[PDB]
Structure formats: C-alpha cells, structure tokens
Design a protein around this ligand. Structure first.
Ligand SMILES: Cc1cc2nc3c(=O)[nH]c(=O)nc-3n(C[C@H](O)[C@H](O)[C@H](O)COP(=O)(O)O)c2cc1C
Ligand SMILES: Cc1cc2nc3c(=O)[nH]c(=O)nc-3n(C[C@H](O)[C@H](O)[C@H](O)COP(=O)(O)O)c2cc1C
Ligand SMILES: Cc1cc2nc3c(=O)[nH]c(=O)nc-3n(C[C@H](O)[C@H](O)[C@H](O)COP(=O)(O)O)c2cc1C
Ligand SMILES: Cc1cc2nc3c(=O)[nH]c(=O)nc-3n(C[C@H](O)[C@H](O)[C@H](O)COP(=O)(O)O)c2cc1C
Lengths: 369, 369, 369, 369
C-alpha cells in the first residue's frame, strides 16, 4: 500500500487472529515482498543454529503441579524499577520498515498497549524521537550499534537520553554480518532509509555521507567501550549477544548493568549453540547480580516459562512481532503479545506458579528426548 | 444417526475388526464430525508432549525370557479388593457423547463385558445413575471436577455413593484448559448436555444456570480438599494428574488412597514430560503404599507390560476407547479391550510372566535408541 | 510356475546380480505372492524392534587400520571341529516353500556351494531326509520346535541323527506367535505342507492329524528339556532366542553346547531390544565357554564384522536368503552368501584383520550418533 | 566439449557464483556425465559414514565471543616453513579428469591463485611434471599409492622430487576399494588415462602394461615402507587415512613427518566413524609433534573453524573442488576456495580469533543435539 524505493510496505491497522506465533511466518509471507520476507525469516549458513533455537526448548520439561493452591497467575514484573504488565518484550530489530510503513512507531504502540518493554534500534526506518513520541509514557530501551566515530555514538546516545530511554542495549555479536543465503538467492538490496543515520548526517555529522556513516560501524569492540557508554549516558548498559558464562562476567566487570543472552536469532555464528542451551550456565555465573534478558527461538508459552525458570528476567521476541506488525500494524503487534501472554498464563496455572518470581524459582526437569 | 444441537452421534452396536489401537483414530475420523474428532484427537500447543507420550515407551525394553517354564498367562488382578479380569481400564473422559448417542452407558457395558474397571466422568452426556445402571454389578469409579460450590461437590458425591461407586478420582491437572489449536481451527462449540450439572440444577442446585455451575469449577485445589472428599464419602480418593514424586507424596499425606499418573493425554501442560518417563520415579517414592493407575499414550501390549513393570497397578486408555465407542458402541468398546488384552498375553508369554504380579516384578532393560 | 493350494512358488535356478542384501526385498516382492511376501517381510506390533535390528549396527564403529601389514583376508572358520569357508550361515526358517518349489533343498545346495553351514527347520515344506540328501556331505544343523509329545520330539531327532546332522538348535522364543499385522491385513492362510509333521503322522505318530500334531507344540519349555534333548541325541544342543546374559548362563547350566543370540528377526517380542544391542554383554558372561551364533538384521559386510567383533562365532541370515531363493533357487542362495562374503573381505582388509579370529579380537569404537 | 574414450569432459574457464559448497554437487550433476558424477559423489555400502562426515560437525559448537577487541581476521599459516594464504587445501583426488579436460592442471592454477597448498595424485589424468608446470612456484605435495614394485615407487618419487614437491602423502586406507554401489548401478568403466603410469611404462617400467602396473598396487603396507620412502626422498612423508590415536603414534614411530586424518570421504570402510569424531583424540596423542591435515565432509566456514579448533593444522576439500573444476576450470577452483575463505573469516570475527593460531587455541562447546 506504501511504496519506498520500489519496496511495498504494509499499512494494515487491525487486531489479528493468531493460532500460534510460528504460524505468523507463513501468514506474513503472503503480504511481505519475497526479498524482505527472506531477509526477516532467514539465518546464516545452513540455518542449523536457527533450527536448534526452537528444538532446544525440548531439552528441559515443566512439571505440572498437583494441589498447587493457586489461581489467576499474574504476569507483572519490573526491570530497573520500571513496572511491566508482562515479562515478554520486543527484541531490537532494525528492519521493521520491511514489514510496515509505520515501522517501530506501530511496534512502540503495540508494546505500550500491553504494558511491555519496547527496544528501539540504531538502523530503524524511523527516528529515535518519532518512536518515543509514538510510545508516549511507555518505557523504551535504545539498541546501539557502536561506530568507530564517537561523535556518532554520543549524538545517538544524546538523542536516546532526550527521548527518556531507560537503558542502552550494546549489540556486540554482529561486528560482521553472518552469511545469509536468502539475500544472495533473492539478490536483495536493503531499500529503506536509516532515519537515525540521516539525522546524524544533517546534525553533528556535518553532512557526512550515509554509506560512510554506515561503514564506520566498529568491528573492534572492547570492555572499555562498555564503561565509556555507561559514563557518557549515566544509563544502565546491557550487553547483547552473550553466549558464555565467561563473557557475562567480563561484561559485568566492564560496567554492564545487564546481560542479554542472544545468538541474534541464528543470523550470525551458525554452528554456535542454541541460545536456550547456554542460558542456565550464564545465569549461574551472573547469580542475579544484574538482570538477564533472553531471546532467540521463543514462540510458545512453555518456551517463555522455561527461559524464566532457567534464569531469564525478561524474554524478547524478534520475528513473530515483525510478522504481526506486517499483518496488523499497532494492533497486530498487540495481538502477538496478548497471544503469548495467554499461552504463558495457562502454563503458570498448570505449573502452580502465581507470579513471575515463582516461575523464576521453578525447577525444570531434565529427561533426554 | 442421532442428532443433538446439530451434532451427529454414532448409533453403531457391533464387534469391530481391530488391526491395532493407533489405527482406530483414522477409522473413527471417517464417522465422527470434524469438530468433535479434532476435540478428541488433539493435544495442547504444538502437541510435543502428546507425541512423546507414544515415543517414551521406546526408552525401556522388555527382555524375552528363554526357558521360562510358564504357559497361559493370566490377566486377573485386584484394586481395593475388587476382582478384575484385566489390568487395562477406562480413563475418565467427559466427551464420550461426541462419539456415540449412548455415551458412557455403552462404555460401561463394554467394560462390564471384559471384567474391566469403568471410570465415569463429571461432564458426561449421561447421568451417574444411568451409567451405573448400564454397568449392572460391574465396578465403577467416579471422576470429580471439584467446584468452589461444596453443595455441588456433595450432591455429585452423594449421587456417586448411591450408584455404589467404589472410589473417587479427583482430577487436578485441568484447573484451566490447555491451549488446544484443533478447536480454534474447527471453531468448535461443545454441543452436548452435561447430565450431572443439569441434574444438580434441578435438585440441590435450586435452578442455578448450567453455565454458572460450569464456571464454578475450582482453579484453587489444596491438599485439604482431598481429605474433605475422603471424610465426606468414606470412599478411597485417587488424585489424577500427578507427574512428580513430590506431588505423589503430598497427595498421600493429604489423605489420597491412590495415585493416578497422567498428563491428561498431552492436552494440558505441553512442554511437560511424557507420562511414561516419570512413572518409575513416582512408583519408587510411593513404594506400594497405595495403588498406582497410569495413562497417556498406551496403545500396544508392550506399552501395557512396560507400564506395569515400571510401577503401575492398572493402565487406563482414553482415545482408543472413544474411537471404538464411535465405531461399534458397547461391542466396539469390548473389542478395544479384547484386542489390547490379546497383545498383552503374547508379550507376557514371551517375557516369561505368568501373572500380572510377575509383570510388576519384571526388570525392563534401558538401552538408549 | 509351481502351484500348491492356490499359492504360486518360484522355480527359478540362476545366479542373481545383487546390489546389496537390503535391495533383495523389493526385488523378491515383484515375484512372491503378496500374502507370502508379507509373511516373510513383516515383524510384530509396530515393527519397532525389526527396524532397530538394522539401526543398532550404527551403535558401534569399525576403526580403519593404517599400516596393517596384511593382505588377502581369509573367511575360513570352524564350529564343533566342522570346517567352514565362511562365518555367514543360514538361520533356520520354516517358510522357505513360500519363496521356491525346492524350498530348503535349494537353500541346502547354495550353502554347500559356498562351504557354509545350513540349518534345516521343523516346519519345512520338505523333509529332513530330502534336505540332507540335497546338501550331500555339507554340514547341517536341525532346528527343533519341541512338542509336549516326546514321541514327536524323539522321532524328528532320530530322523535328524539318521541325516548326519551335527547339532540341534532348540528355538525357545516363539512359544506363542508374535502379533504380525501383515498376515491380518493380507488375510493370509499358510498354504504349505509341513513335510516333517506329515512323515511323523505316517510313522511313529500312528495317523494323528496334522493340526493336532501342530497344536501339540510346547509353550512350557524348561531347562530340563535342554538336558533331555542332549542326552537323547548325544549331539550339541544350541538354545536359540537368548537376549540376556542371565538366560545364556541358565542355558549352559541346563546342558546347552551353544548360545544362539536372536530376537527372531523382530517377529516375536516387539518392544524388546535390537539383537545387536545385547550381543556383547551376552558374550562377556559366556566368556567363550561355548560357541555363539548371532542373527537379526544382518545385511552388510560391516554388520557381520561388528557381530564377530562383539562376541559372535557365526552370523546367520534369514530374510535375505529367502529373497535370493525366490529370485534364483540354489544359485540365488549362493549369490547372497558370495555377495555378503565380498563385502566382509573388503571390511577385513581395511580393518587390518587377516582371519576370522582377528575380527573376533577386534575392538570396536563406541561414539554416539 | 572434450571427448576421451566416449566420456565428455568440461572445458569451462570462468568464475562461478557459489551459494555454498554443498550446492555445487547438484550444479555439477547437470554437466558431468552420470557415470562420472556417481563415481565422484558416492560412498561405500549404504553411505552411513559419508552422511555422518557432514552431521558430526554438529557434535561441537563454536562460542560467539563478546567484546573480543579484534577485527580483520587473517587466514595466513605455514606448513614445513611453506607460507600459505589459507589453511584450506586441496585433498589428493585421482579422478579430476572426470570433471575437466585440464584435470589437476586447472586445480593447480586455482590453488596457486588463492595461495593454497595443492596435492597432486598418483592416478591423475595429467603427469606430475605438467601439474607442477601449471602451478608455477606454488607449493605442491605428491600423493603416492605405493606399488609392490619399488622401481615404480622410486620412479614416481624421482619425478615428484624433480617437480620440486615439498612432501609425499602416503595414502594407506585404500589397499582395496570400498564397495561403491553408484559404479555398479551406472555400470561405470573408468575411462581416463593414468598419465603417471603411462610415463613409468615408457621409461623405467620398460614397456610393462598399464593394467599390470595398476594391479601391482601394494595391499600389504608396513611401518618400514614409511621409513623407506622418507630415506629415499629426504622429503617429509605424511600418512593419510589415520582414524585412531594408536595409528597416529605408529605412523610417527615409523618416520612420518605428518598425520592426515581422513576416511577417504566415506568411500572406504563404511561403518567406520565420521572423520571429525576421531580428530580431537588423534590430535591429543600427537601433541603437536608433527602437523595434522584433516578432511572428509568439510563444506562450511564453521566446519573449517571446528576442525582447526579440534587439532587440525590444515583442512582439505575433495568433492567441492572437483565440482567447481567441472563448473569453471581454474577460476571455478579459485571460486570454491574464495567462497570457503569468506565463510571462515566471518566465523573467526564472530568467534574473536584474529589468526589461524587463535582458531587452533579455541575451546569448542560440547552440548548434545
Ligand atoms: C530481521 C531482523 C533484524 C534484526 N535487527 C537487529 C538489530 O538491528 N539489532 C540487534 O541488536 N538485533 C537485531 N536482530 C536480532 C533480534 O534482536 C533478536 O536477537 C532475534 O530476532 C531473536 O530471535 P527470534 O527472531 O527467533 O525471536 C534482528 C533480527 C531480525 C530477524
Ligand atoms: C476427549 C477427551 C476428554 C477427556 N475428558 C476428561 C475428563 O473429563 N476428566 C479427566 O479426568 N480426564 C479426561 N481426559 C483425560 C483422560 O482421562 C486420559 O488422561 C487421557 O485420554 C489418556 O491419554 P490417551 O488418550 O492417550 O490414552 C480426557 C481425554 C480426552 C482425549
Ligand atoms: C519367514 C520366516 C520364517 C522363520 N521361521 C523360523 C523357524 O521356523 N524357526 C526358527 O528357529 N526361526 C525362524 N525364523 C527366524 C530366523 O531363524 C531368524 O532368527 C531371522 O530371520 C533373523 O533375522 P533376519 O531375517 O533379519 O536376518 C523365521 C524368520 C522368518 C523371516
Ligand atoms: C572422486 C574421488 C577420487 C579420489 N581419489 C583419491 C586418490 O587418488 N588418493 C587419495 O589419497 N585420496 C583420494 N580421494 C579422497 C580425498 O583425498 C579425500 O579424502 C576426500 O575427497 C575427502 O572428503 P570430501 O570429498 O567430503 O571433502 C578421492 C576422493 C574422491 C571423491
């Protein structure tokens, strides 16, 4: 309905009927142009890690609780003193303009509607200021792709601070792009503007070209960069892409106020483990000294419960939210979170867990299947 | 042949040719309306637990016994001093009217014909009194879905006592319904009356609406509820839905006279383990202090043998009996139990086990496949 | 080409081109009538054990030997002082008339041609005397299905002794038939005469009916029956169907001069382990005090090598030989043994094993796949 | 485009677009005659080992490294003081004339273009002198199939020394050919000349027939043969086909200056383990006393990284290079190495490994999938 550089964007704004989150992919495939769809759906190399992100949830099982003496489970929780209606949040994803003309503005509205946490992205088709304006008083985190150019870093961080963002997510697992075959097969050219890079170019970036700003992304990321971002913003800094206990501890020693356990939805180091399979050992080393956010493969209520029980404080979604955004805009995003909340409330009742803390204190079984 | 609220019910009354119990599903799918069929066949979320209920029987193997010195195995056993011709019994299932116009009356007749134990259900399309009348002197258990309304609980328990039921099964693993996609895809409305709720409404329920009685089902179930039902009936109370050793012991401490190991045929907490995979550890903690009933996934003689050898005293069937009920009414149900008895007698002879006690004392192998 | 009771039998007599033994099944399926084919190919219940008989060979691996200093491996071996050109032998199979009009006479000729050991069966379509006459001076074992009628047992054993048989195989794992669905689906009636039962009827059986003789098969088999057959024949008695170390030792204590590790090609106790998976523990308890024969699932050279390396002295084939018999009679059987010998000689060269003893002393790897 | 003995050879000379190395097989299948294609693609028996060569890379996982402080990974390495731009090399393969009229001359050019190590083969369609002339100053190893005729061995070794080859690869795992069904199904006759055997016949072989020279290949290979080749050439001798730690140590004790861990691409001892599954235990026994070369199943960047991290110094490719040779000659071979280098550089950046030594010192995870 909206065209940008030859690419068709959804303008839909409606509640959507959701059977489950996995089925949103084939539904969204009918309306997202083939190149954009492949960009969103695909992982790196032969997609082994992407597939294992789903299958790894079967490595642990939830015990049904008999005679639990609870009813009406509550999804409410908190991070950094911010109250949330649900522990399910939006993973930062820079390609939401591939799904919808409103991009992260509609995603921001959907998260605000369910009282969930929104993460806005460096490469968004819409500006930090626009996305925060769309969300109103709803809490937002800002995901930074750090540049070699500290003028770029400080300009985007100042824009995030002006937009009242509550934390910075430093993404460190994409210093180069994974080898994604879908984009090669589709001969796909990313067709969207990058509103934050355009704004920097027009402001403190003194007219520097967009391709030059893009190419300035840092491949060399050190612990001292974490402390520098923390000192500059006086916001909590969360390191995203952690897949080992040792890296969690190095991040906390470098000044991180949070650990985001992620393999980038299996789009980066193919042949790395399923994200779920390293969560518990990471959480054991962290020992609750900072909040943990988990993503990569979460689709069912049982998956969310298992991630919380294995040491996550919040659980993020990427692809299912992008598909819901294409299918129904702001109300489409709302529908995805409401659907997953419903599947989680059922599991919590059957597992005897009244609150999100009770889920976190739940002991999963470990039979081999 | 019979229509109720637009829904077609079987009136068949015939012996059926059974290749195996798994094949009854595709046979019954030709005659049960699509919505009713999906309601019966389906499990929760992605049906992982439902599938594992079948595959988990491969986690243990039966040793053939050479030079066993036995012939003509005997299927006879006992629970609470009640003699039975077979250790295979009917799992309580509230939806038998979806298969057949006689519902649990035909099931009661089939179980009486093989000298097996019948369990009648709270939500049956036919009354406690009718089902007990159909069974004649055959032993029956009554499955209770406990209400917040103790007038409802005491009325149904009094009706069960008047019908000479020998034990109460308290089902505790369905305080909310699992998320079952088949009913969403089929847009299925349960079309049957609930004869026990209608009777309560007309009697001690003083005209209270059916939907209001239904909605009064307790989500908060505590150990003290078990003792209260035991004190009120002076019958043995069996807790159904136990999937952990700790919950077995809590149930016995609360006054349970039996443990029913079940995950509700994978219809409830999807992402929970296969029922077979927790049976042996539950039976080790119970240490024969009360009888154990096992269900969820039982289809072959080898499955029944493995459940008895892993600590079950009785093994229940759900779906295969519902399918046989659709296909042949009372004689259809009889055919299902006779078929599974035949497969079990073959295994017992080849395994060198003369009696059901010998099966229970059998040591299964544990190679990994 | 030959008709018996409506059933078409092969009369083929030719060398056959063999890609591998597994492919003989689809080749033979083109020429064996559907009912006979299903009788041969099928296993019991859902054929899990039958399938695992094949897959279990992957549980161990053969190390290639570098710098082995050997060439021209030799397949020669010995049992009870009988010289054999190959450790691959014929498993006793009572249904060879379903494949070919000559039945075990052609099988006897094929085994004689490769210098292999033939086992003739109780229920053969052709007599003990005819099969031994067909084999000439080639060594034969006789497989007994023990009757309750010791007049029957002693008559067949006397006939076996007159035919110069070198050992008795007592089959003990088929006291009842496994539940085989193929025969139910095909509505298959065994159409062949049982030449040994007819001969008994005409001789010491004093005209007793064939069905009555057949029905006299013993379901109660005790250790004292083994010693009785040994005392009566003064031949070595091998117990067939052993799947546990304890049963191997009980058989040796009862007077057995050999152990035949078998699950009857997955036709009997479905839900029992793969035959290969219990071989090594049985061989560890036997500790070479008597020869071990292994069968059930052997198709490739690597399978034969792995069975010998895991404690077998001889490895038997059932189904592949029956299929080769249908396809080419005596030369068809010869072709099957020559093909498997060729695959084994290649493995022995690459594994650095000069003789069959070197294979038996080989240490298999145990990586998990 | 070129015909030899009825067989069509590629004459292509072009850069090729590569999605991944696995997809080269179906691309090359469109242009290689069916018999030649089956000869290249196939393994022995049922191809279990061939399949496991691929699946075994999933037995270990690469940890993404957060805050790694590196960029621009370097692929440079060294063997025997020879500088290489990449640790990926050409496995010796005697059938390159089945892909292309230039055979190993084009392969030699492709390896020279990426600064990689070429291995020329005994049975090549082109001579040792021609292949070395094609490669210019690029380093080459010569793979020997040892004869019983030491006049043959010394003539080819003298030709290799004259061609400035830097090491001898003694292949010891093909003393007989594996049973390869593709050649049986295709009725395939190897149609190419063997230029090295023809040259020997015309020179020191004094007119001896090609079939007679071919048939003189040694099946009996001893440790003293390794020392004899080392003494005669004064070159490092690498033993190829090692699959056990014990055989690695026996090879080093016999005078080997290198170990080449290989199962010949699953073409030899089917039922042997996946090559990757024995690499680490071999490397633990070798303890860096000599270089290790690894092959069999390598297709992705993650595979190369995992082999280096598990104790390989160099990683060889067979089939993918043969397919690239068919598709684009010298530039086709170049394209295959450039593609795999690109996938490896991405993994090294995401894993935090600056150099090939850093990859070798990387600790892989070992979760079970
Ligand atoms: C299309 C797409 C774009 C993404 N862009 C970003 C990004 O800009 N920054 C970032 O930190 N992660 C990005 N991610 C990774 C997500 O934050 C998240 O780790 C991933 O989507 C989680 O896996 P899931 O999609 O299976 O839920 C992206 C993921 C997708 C699929
Ligand atoms: C259609 C249907 C209705 C059911 N209704 C009840 C019920 O009313 N009460 C109860 O305790 N269990 C109920 N169950 C669960 C059964 O008691 C039993 O646990 C289950 O069917 C066992 O698994 P199986 O079907 O694989 O044998 C029901 C199961 C099915 C399939
Ligand atoms: C069609 C058929 C008939 C058989 N009849 C007999 C028999 O009469 N006596 C016996 O001891 N075993 C019998 N067996 C079992 C074989 O001796 C042997 O254990 C089996 O075929 C081995 O497995 P395989 O077919 O996979 O090689 C029979 C097997 C088949 C398939
Ligand atoms: C068609 C073909 C011909 C081969 N010829 C030889 C050879 O002449 N000498 C040798 O040492 N290895 C030979 N090999 C084995 C390779 O050196 C190497 O071990 C194998 O191709 C590695 O597995 P991959 O193909 O999966 O990469 C050959 C392999 C193939 C597929």
């Amino acid at each position: 309905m909206t065209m940008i550089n030859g690419y068709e964007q959804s303008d839909r704004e409606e509640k959507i009927d959701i059977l489950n989150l996995e089925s949103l992919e084939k539904q969204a495939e009918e309306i997202i142009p083939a190149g954009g769809f492949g960009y969103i759906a695909g992982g790196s190399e032969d997609e082994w890690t992407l597939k294992q992100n789903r299958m790894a949830f079967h490595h642990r099982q939830i015990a049904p609780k008999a005679l639990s003496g609870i009813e009406k489970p509550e999804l409410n929780t908190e991070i950094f003193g911010i109250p949330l209606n649900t522990p399910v949040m939006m993973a930062p994803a820079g390609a939401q303009g591939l799904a919808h003309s409103q991009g992260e503005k509609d995603t921001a509205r959907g998260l605000a509607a369910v009282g969930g946490l929104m993460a806005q992205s460096t490469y968004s088709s819409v500006s930090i200021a626009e996305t925060a304006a769309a969300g109103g008083d709803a809490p937002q985190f800002f995901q930074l792709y750090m540049s070699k150019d500290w003028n770029f870093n400080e300009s985007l961080l100042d824009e995030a601070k002006k937009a009242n963002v509550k934390a910075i997510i430093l993404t460190v697992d994409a210093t180069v792009d994974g080898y994604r075959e879908a984009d090669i097969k589709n001969k796909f050219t990313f067709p969207l503007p990058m509103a934050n890079l355009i704004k920097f170019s027009e402001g403190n970036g003194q007219g520097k070209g967009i391709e030059e700003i893009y190419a300035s992304a840092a491949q060399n990321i050190r612990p001292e960069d974490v402390k520098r971002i923390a000192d500059y913003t006086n916001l909590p800094v969360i390191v995203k892409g952690i897949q080992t206990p040792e890296d969690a501890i190095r991040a906390i020693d470098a000044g991180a106020a949070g650990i985001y356990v992620s393999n980038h939805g299996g789009r980066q180091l193919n042949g790395g483990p399923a994200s779920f399979d390293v969560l518990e050992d990471i959480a054991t080393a962290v020992n609750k000294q900072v909040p943990i956010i988990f993503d990569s493969g979460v689709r069912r209520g049982s998956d969310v419960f298992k991630a919380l029980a294995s040491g996550a404080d919040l659980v993020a979604l990427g692809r299912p939210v992008i598909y819901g955004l294409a299918l129904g805009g702001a109300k489409g995003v709302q529908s995805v979170f409401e659907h997953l909340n419903h599947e989680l409330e059922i599991v919590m009742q059957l597992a005897g867990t009244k609150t999100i803390e009770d889920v976190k204190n739940n002991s999963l079984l470990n039979i081999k299947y």
